[PDB]
Write a protein that binds this ligand. Structure first.
Ligand SMILES: Cc1cc2nc3c(=O)[nH]c(=O)nc-3n(C[C@H](O)[C@H](O)[C@H](O)COP(=O)(O)OP(=O)(O)OC[C@H]3O[C@@H](n4cnc5c(N)ncnc54)[C@H](O)[C@@H]3O)c2cc1C
Length: 295
């Protein structure tokens, strides 16, 4: 409980670590117990330990899709940053859950493998990707997810196949901790994949603030409306609270113009939600995950 580091020396662990250092928005209060496993077995022992002692456990990828309140988070947060491997395996790609999705789409191209193009620009880890059935440009992880190695809440490995894997995953429910993923790709010319990747980078760059830290598109798309358009239409574009701003480039993004805090994010998110429902009677529901409690 407080006793974890005792049982497992040799497992890189940290005390009361402020998470903003590891999050894509550069925000979030501290997490009381922060663990980074070098090994799969290490991940197992910790998951099992927390389960058995009923200690709430959270898995943090790169927080490119979450906001962590300044009250921080209770229990143990596991970050699988050290599980980084990416491998070639005939027409198939195997990547560990701590690998960056962008690197996995870079690899694919070096091998003349097609099917990942859609992810050359999606930030975050492979673990987050499977958890979110990450997708962009009509493409999606489920389109090419072959197999995954996972940890059940009790700590056991479970090797999954297509059948057992099923809009931004059966991984989400069933609360599996992804350890590595296998994508079924197809052989195709470098040039053709290149033209898609350039097309996609061009497209995304033209429309997204990639320069600023942010989570992604903050809201799910309301039936027959664009999040961004509503926001923009409600006069909220450019709005600032503390160090947070409804992006002047894409109104559905809240960028960090410097020193933003999770409080700032939650506050801007709520004010947008509130203003939008007053002008158009539409419920903007967050896409981005919200975790920790109120400081
Ligand atoms: C500029 C920008 C653009 C973006 N564009 C897109 C886009 O085009 N398409 C898109 O789909 N998303 C997009 N996102 C959101 C984000 O990139 C994806 O949701 C991403 O896959 C999340 O990765 P992560 O590792 O950051 O997850 P985190 O934000 O760290 O957490 C995400 C969720 O996954 C869970 N999780 C994380 N790792 C694991 C693991 N190993 N096992 C199990 N669960 C895990 C977390 O507990 C949490 O529920 C964008 C974000 C930004 C900031």
């Amino acid at each position: 409980m407080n006793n974890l580091q005792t049982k497992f020396p040799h497992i890189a662990i940290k005390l009361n670590e402020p998470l903003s250092k590891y999050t894509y928005t550069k925000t979030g209060g501290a997490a009381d117990v922060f663990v980074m496993p070098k090994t799969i077995e290490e991940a197992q022992e910790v998951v099992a330990y927390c389960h058995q002692n009923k200690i709430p456990l959270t898995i943090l990828g790169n927080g490119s899709n979450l906001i962590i309140k300044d009250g921080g988070i209770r229990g143990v947060i596991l970050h699988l940053d050290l599980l980084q491997t990416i491998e070639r395996n005939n027409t198939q790609i195997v990547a560990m859950s701590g690998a960056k999705l962008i690197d996995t789409a870079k690899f694919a191209l070096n091998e003349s493998l097609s099917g990942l193009e859609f992810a050359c620009g999606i930030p975050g880890s492979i673990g987050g990707a499977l958890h979110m059935n990450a997708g962009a440009y009509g493409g999606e992880i489920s389109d090419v997810l072959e197999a995954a190695t996972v940890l059940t809440q009790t700590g056991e490995l479970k090797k999954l196949k297509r059948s057992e894997l099923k809009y931004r995953s059966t991984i989400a429910e069933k609360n599996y901790i992804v350890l590595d993923a296998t994508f079924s790709l197809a052989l195709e010319e470098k040039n053709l994949i290149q033209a898609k990747m350039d097309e996609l980078t061009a497209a995304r760059e033209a429309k997204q603030p990639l320069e600023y830290p942010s989570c992604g598109s903050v809201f799910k798309r309301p039936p027959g409306h664009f999040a961004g358009k509503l926001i923009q239409d409600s006069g909220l574009q450019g709005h600032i609270i503390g160090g947070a701003q409804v992006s002047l480039k894409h109104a559905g993004f809240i960028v960090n113009i410097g020193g933003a805090t999770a409080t700032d994010y939650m506050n801007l998110i709520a004010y947008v939600q509130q203003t939008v429902r007053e002008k158009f009677d539409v419920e903007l529901e967050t896409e981005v995950k919200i975790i920790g409690e109120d400081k």
